[PDB]
Each structure stands twice: as C-alpha cells, then as structure tokens.
Design a protein around this motif. Structure first.
Motif, PDB file in Angstrom:
ATOM      1  N   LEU C   5       0.840  -1.187   0.000  1.00  0.00           N
ATOM      2  CA  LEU C   5       0.000   0.000   0.000  1.00  0.00           C
ATOM      3  C   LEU C   5       0.878   1.241   0.000  1.00  0.00           C
ATOM      4  O   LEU C   5       1.838   1.332   0.771  1.00  0.00           O
ATOM      5  CB  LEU C   5      -0.928   0.026   1.215  1.00  0.00           C
ATOM      6  N   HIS C   6       0.535   2.194  -0.865  1.00  0.00           N
ATOM      7  CA  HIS C   6       1.213   3.492  -0.963  1.00  0.00           C
ATOM      8  C   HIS C   6       2.695   3.236  -1.242  1.00  0.00           C
ATOM      9  O   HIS C   6       3.015   2.455  -2.148  1.00  0.00           O
ATOM     10  CB  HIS C   6       0.912   4.307   0.286  1.00  0.00           C
ATOM     11  N   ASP C   7       3.616   3.855  -0.504  1.00  0.00           N
ATOM     12  CA  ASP C   7       5.047   3.723  -0.777  1.00  0.00           C
ATOM     13  C   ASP C   7       5.630   2.579   0.051  1.00  0.00           C
ATOM     14  O   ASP C   7       6.363   2.769   1.022  1.00  0.00           O
ATOM     15  CB  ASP C   7       5.762   5.037  -0.495  1.00  0.00           C
ATOM     16  N   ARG C   8       5.287   1.362  -0.359  1.00  0.00           N
ATOM     17  CA  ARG C   8       5.820   0.166   0.271  1.00  0.00           C
ATOM     18  C   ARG C   8       6.133  -0.865  -0.801  1.00  0.00           C
ATOM     19  O   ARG C   8       5.531  -0.869  -1.878  1.00  0.00           O
ATOM     20  CB  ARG C   8       4.847  -0.404   1.309  1.00  0.00           C
ATOM     21  N   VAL C   9       7.102  -1.727  -0.504  1.00  0.00           N
ATOM     22  CA  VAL C   9       7.597  -2.726  -1.440  1.00  0.00           C
ATOM     23  C   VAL C   9       7.692  -4.063  -0.722  1.00  0.00           C
ATOM     24  O   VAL C   9       8.152  -4.137   0.425  1.00  0.00           O
ATOM     25  CB  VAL C   9       8.971  -2.335  -2.027  1.00  0.00           C
ATOM     26  N   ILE C  10       7.239  -5.114  -1.403  1.00  0.00           N
ATOM     27  CA  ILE C  10       7.429  -6.493  -0.969  1.00  0.00           C
ATOM     28  C   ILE C  10       8.653  -7.027  -1.698  1.00  0.00           C
ATOM     29  O   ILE C  10       8.660  -7.097  -2.933  1.00  0.00           O
ATOM     30  CB  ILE C  10       6.197  -7.354  -1.286  1.00  0.00           C
ATOM     31  N   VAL C  11       9.675  -7.421  -0.941  1.00  0.00           N
ATOM     32  CA  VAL C  11      10.950  -7.859  -1.493  1.00  0.00           C
ATOM     33  C   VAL C  11      11.280  -9.240  -0.944  1.00  0.00           C
ATOM     34  O   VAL C  11      11.007  -9.549   0.219  1.00  0.00           O
ATOM     35  CB  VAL C  11      12.075  -6.850  -1.167  1.00  0.00           C
ATOM     36  N   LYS C  12      11.856 -10.082  -1.798  1.00  0.00           N
ATOM     37  CA  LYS C  12      12.348 -11.395  -1.394  1.00  0.00           C
ATOM     38  C   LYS C  12      13.860 -11.300  -1.238  1.00  0.00           C
ATOM     39  O   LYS C  12      14.585 -11.182  -2.231  1.00  0.00           O
ATOM     40  CB  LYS C  12      11.963 -12.467  -2.409  1.00  0.00           C
ATOM     41  N   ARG C  13      14.330 -11.346   0.007  1.00  0.00           N
ATOM     42  CA  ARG C  13      15.758 -11.244   0.275  1.00  0.00           C
ATOM     43  C   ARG C  13      16.496 -12.444  -0.301  1.00  0.00           C
ATOM     44  O   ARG C  13      16.065 -13.590  -0.139  1.00  0.00           O
ATOM     45  CB  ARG C  13      16.001 -11.144   1.781  1.00  0.00           C
ATOM     46  N   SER C  86       9.366   0.461   3.278  1.00  0.00           N
ATOM     47  CA  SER C  86       9.077   1.683   2.547  1.00  0.00           C
ATOM     48  C   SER C  86      10.114   1.894   1.451  1.00  0.00           C
ATOM     49  O   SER C  86      11.269   1.473   1.568  1.00  0.00           O
ATOM     50  CB  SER C  86       9.056   2.882   3.491  1.00  0.00           C
ATOM     51  N   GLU C  87       9.686   2.549   0.369  1.00  0.00           N
ATOM     52  CA  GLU C  87      10.584   2.769  -0.760  1.00  0.00           C
ATOM     53  C   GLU C  87      11.796   3.600  -0.352  1.00  0.00           C
ATOM     54  O   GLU C  87      12.872   3.463  -0.947  1.00  0.00           O
ATOM     55  CB  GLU C  87       9.817   3.429  -1.909  1.00  0.00           C
ATOM     56  N   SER C  88      11.649   4.444   0.671  1.00  0.00           N
ATOM     57  CA  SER C  88      12.788   5.213   1.166  1.00  0.00           C
ATOM     58  C   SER C  88      13.886   4.296   1.688  1.00  0.00           C
ATOM     59  O   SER C  88      15.077   4.583   1.519  1.00  0.00           O
ATOM     60  CB  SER C  88      12.333   6.180   2.257  1.00  0.00           C
ATOM     61  N   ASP C  89      13.507   3.186   2.327  1.00  0.00           N
ATOM     62  CA  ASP C  89      14.497   2.237   2.825  1.00  0.00           C
ATOM     63  C   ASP C  89      15.274   1.567   1.702  1.00  0.00           C
ATOM     64  O   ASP C  89      16.348   1.011   1.954  1.00  0.00           O
ATOM     65  CB  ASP C  89      13.821   1.177   3.694  1.00  0.00           C
ATOM     66  N   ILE C  90      14.760   1.600   0.476  1.00  0.00           N
ATOM     67  CA  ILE C  90      15.471   1.034  -0.668  1.00  0.00           C
ATOM     68  C   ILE C  90      16.591   1.995  -1.051  1.00  0.00           C
ATOM     69  O   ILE C  90      16.338   3.049  -1.641  1.00  0.00           O
ATOM     70  CB  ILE C  90      14.526   0.788  -1.848  1.00  0.00           C
ATOM     71  N   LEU C  91      17.834   1.646  -0.710  1.00  0.00           N
ATOM     72  CA  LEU C  91      18.956   2.505  -1.077  1.00  0.00           C
ATOM     73  C   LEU C  91      19.159   2.536  -2.584  1.00  0.00           C
ATOM     74  O   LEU C  91      19.250   3.612  -3.185  1.00  0.00           O
ATOM     75  CB  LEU C  91      20.243   2.053  -0.387  1.00  0.00           C
TER      76      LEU C  91
END
Lengths: 96, 96, 96, 96, 96, 96, 96
Positions: C5-13, C86-91
C-alpha cells in the motif's frame, strides 16, 4: 460551561464496568478506566496551515472511544471530572 | 456498531495459527499473534493539509497485514477484540 | 498474492553468500544476511501532501539494495519470508 | 552496475593517507578513514513535495567531502566497498 | 505593561482553592496550583507559513484552563506572577 | 579549492585570543576556541520546498559567529583546518 | 558592530536585581539572572518556506523578556556580554 478552542474536545468518561458480561463483579485495576466517553463539548475546529478552520467530525453528545496519554488532560468542572483531548486522540465514535 | 475517524481503521485480528504448515502443533509464544486481520470498518479518509479528505485505499472486509505498535490500540466491542490502527500502520492488503 | 500500500515494497531477500570471493565457505555471522533482494511487489505509490499519488521508481522483479531497520518487516506468505519496507528504505536498485 | 534513486549517491571512499605532510608514516586510528571520496553514481534527484524531481548538484566522478553517520551505508559490489549516502550527507565537492 | 508577540498569552493564574466543595479546607499539595487563569494580555497572533498573521481566539480578560509544562513560563511584573504560554498550551476558555 | 553545497559555508576559525583585554595571558581551556571565523566559501544557497535556490546572506571573506555542535564539521585542506557548517549554524556577521 | 541574520536578535541582558521590593539585598542564586534585556540588534527577518523574508516584530532598543535555553548563546563583543537568540526565544516585549 467550558468550550474548547481549535481541535479540542471536552469528553465525560463513562463509569468503568463494575460487572462483566457473565454477571461477575470486577474490582480494582481489573475494572480498568473505560476508554469510551460521551462528548460534552466540541471546539471550533482543526486549524490548517492555509488559515482556514476545519470543523471537527465529532459531534456533541456522541460516545467516542479515545486514548489516554499525555495529550489528554483531567479537569474539574462543577465537582465533576472531564477529559480535554485533541480530536486526533479520539480514536473513533460510537453509534447505536 | 463502531466506525473510525479519518485514516483510522477497525480490524479484527485473525486467530493465531495453532497448527504449522507441516502438521506440528504450535503453542505458547511460538504461536505468536498473527499480523493479518480482516478489516471491519474504514474511516472517512485521511485529511491532508489543504482541507480535502481522501478515501483510504483499504476496503471493508479485506484481510490486511498490519504492524503492532504504539499506534494500534486494543478495544472490546460486543464481547470481541478489535484493533484501532492508522492506515499507515496497515502494511498491505491480502488478496486471493 | 500480496501487494503493498502506498510507498511500500514487498521484497524477497536473496540467500546469504555461503562461499567467499576466493572459495572460502563462510558460516555463522560471516555469512551475514544479504541486503539485496528481488522486488516481489510494488505499491501504488507515495502520496504527496496535495493528494496526488506518484508511482514508486522501483519495478517488480528488480534486485534492490535495501536497509534493515524498523522500517522493514518480515512477514510470512506460503511458508516463505518477505520483507515489507518503505521505498525510502530502498537505497539502490541492482541492474546488470 | 549500481545506481541510486531519488537523493542518494554512490561514492568510493579514497584510501586513508598512510603518510602525513612531512613524510611520517601514520598507522592505526591515527590514519583515520578519509571523509573524501569520488562519486561513482548519482541518483535521479531529490523528491519534492509538489511532485517534481530536482537533479542533485553532485556529478559522477567528482570528489566530495561527506560525513559518516547513520545516513551512509557500506555496501559491497564486486568485492569492493561503496558508500551509499543521501545528498544532504555530502557536505561539499572537491574541485582542482 | 507587558504584551506578547505572535501566539503567546499573558495569564494571571487564579488562587488555589483553599476550601473544597463541602467546606473542607485543603492544604499542602492537596490545594494544588489551579490550571485556570484570567487572561491579562493577548499577542498579535500566530504566524502561518504563507506570511499572514491571524488573531488568537483567546480574548483579554477571559479565564482559560491551560496546561503547565515546558512551554509555560513564570515572570515577575510589578511584584506579581504571570504565566506566558503559547495559545496551543491554552486548553479551553471558561464562559459563565 | 573547496566550495560548499546548498546551505553550507566553509569558514576558517580565527586564532583563539592568547591575551585578554588587560594584557593577561590566557592559556589552556581558559583561552577557549573562538566562535568567530572568516567565511572562506559560500554554497550555492538554501533549497526551499518549491524547488528554488535562495542565495545565502553570508558573503565570502566576512567574519561570522558560528555555534559549535553536530552541524559543524572539521575538515582539513592543505594541512589547514576548516569548519563546514550550515548557514543556520551561523549566528551573526561581524562588520567593522 | 554585530548584526544577526534571518530570525536572530542580539540582546544585552539587564543587571540582575540586587535589592528586592522591600529594599532587602539579594545575593547568590537568590538574585538570579534577569530574563529581560534590551534589544541591541535585530536580524533581517524570519525566512518562510516560499522564499519571502518576514520582518521581526521586535524593534531595536526595546526591552524583551526572553527564555534561557539551548537556543540562546553568549557572545563577547567589546568586552561585553550579549545574548544571541531566535525571535521565537523572545517571549514578550516590555512597554512603559
């Protein structure tokens, strides 16, 4: 009579439930202070940065579920206890 | 009936998985409380600085993954536990 | 299926590198958790103060270098671990 | 290849000065890590509230004086260390 | 004479109630300092981000229930004590 | 040559006064580091929300009074110490 | 001569009252430092987010009651002590 300014609400906290659902009496910290209370007074409205006044969604005489914290304050009006809290601290309203 | 205000959301938490994926029973803190719960009520929508109200992207009856924290609050309605949380605390929604 | 939702990302480490550059097998804290992972799902986009939602710059299926912290949450879907951040956490994003 | 997003910069920190001005070799904590480093990659540009993207003032291949802290992060690409830091953490650039 | 600048109010705190409702005299910490005080002076008004100055909703000579904290300050003018506090620190004015 | 970025200033701190006004020699912590220093370089200017760059009110070669803290950073260029600080950290300029 | 930049004020603190109202001499911490001081210099004015400079409401040569804190700073100009503080740290001017 007390009326708040800006985004502030005067709420009368309801009495804590002495008896539980099954008819058992609750005493001490077990019968904790209720987080729902009827609204006694509503401020003029939330202030925005542009300078307009936005009326609060909370109406007078509606029971609201609120949060206790540093924002809420206890006041004594005609030997009675009221809670002064920002509209943000009001979690929700109770209908029916 | 309880409905929230602005960006807040009323969510019923799903029951914690007593049984794991592989058939082993989970008990105690190992069967931790689930972070997913069906949405019971959606507020009118978050209020921006300009004064408009934007409807929340969550819908009533959709399971959402949320975060436990100071923002979320536990409430009792009709002898049942619900969580009051801001839409920001809602991480995502669960579909299919 | 889970989407944010909004500025969030689901990522598989991605899996931590078992072996070093020269073929030395790393174990324990030596094979520390990888900070890069493929993006599984992209939210609708960050919401601005004026009310417009702008899509996130990341794309589904692109490896991103992310930062661990309070922003990232480890959820489980189909017995698999996914990081919601959050997308901000994505460096950064990994290309080629 | 790795490139950042929004107001983030990929920098390669220069080697710490082994010898001082007078020709004396410095070792240990005395030869502290240099705060200057050549810029390896520049993000798209800082996100503004109105929705516009403003390009960063730094350029690829320019030595910049930066600050260590929580903002900067040490990542490894091709067995080499790169600092990922917000443009605000970049104090200045080095010319001539 | 003392007048404030921007959103600040000069308030003369009312005397703490020596006697309670039933004529029971209260002394020591029991007769705590009252949170109500008549307003002595009102500043020009809060400054918004656009550059305009809006009048405060608090009028001179009206008792206000306020909060004691870091924002409020004690000052000695003509051998008398006054509290200087921001308009936000004012909770609610008293009418009738 | 080093020049700052956005709202940042490169300043050369003046030598700490060895002798006080009365010809008394001050040594040790008593002759504390001076908060005054000539401005060596001025950045392009502070960036506002809308995206415009406003030039700093400080001028190159003008002595300013700076406040030590986390904002100021001590860098070395040509074996000489320079303070890199935000323009907000600058208190007041010195004329005549 | 010293003048400030943006929303900063140079104020000379008044001498701390040696004697009380009844002619009794106060010494030590009892004769605490006065919180009112005459204004020596006024900065250009506070800068808003839109780029305009709003002039400070404080005028040169007017005594102001202020607050001591981390914002205020002590400076030595012509063997004299001056407090540098933001106009927000200024509580209220004194007239007559």
């Amino acid at each position: 009579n007390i009326r708040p300014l800006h985004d502030r609400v005067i709420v009368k906290r309801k009495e804590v439930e002495t008896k539980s659902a099954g008819g058992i009496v609750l005493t001490g910290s077990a019968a904790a202070k209720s987080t729902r209370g009827e609204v006694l007074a509503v401020g003029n409205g939330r202030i925005l940065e542009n300078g307009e006044v936005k009326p609060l969604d909370v109406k007078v005489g509606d029971i609201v579920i609120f949060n206790d914290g540093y924002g809420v304050k206890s006041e004594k009006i005609d030997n009675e206890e009221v809670l002064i809290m920002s509209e943000s601290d009001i979690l929700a309203i109770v209908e029916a």
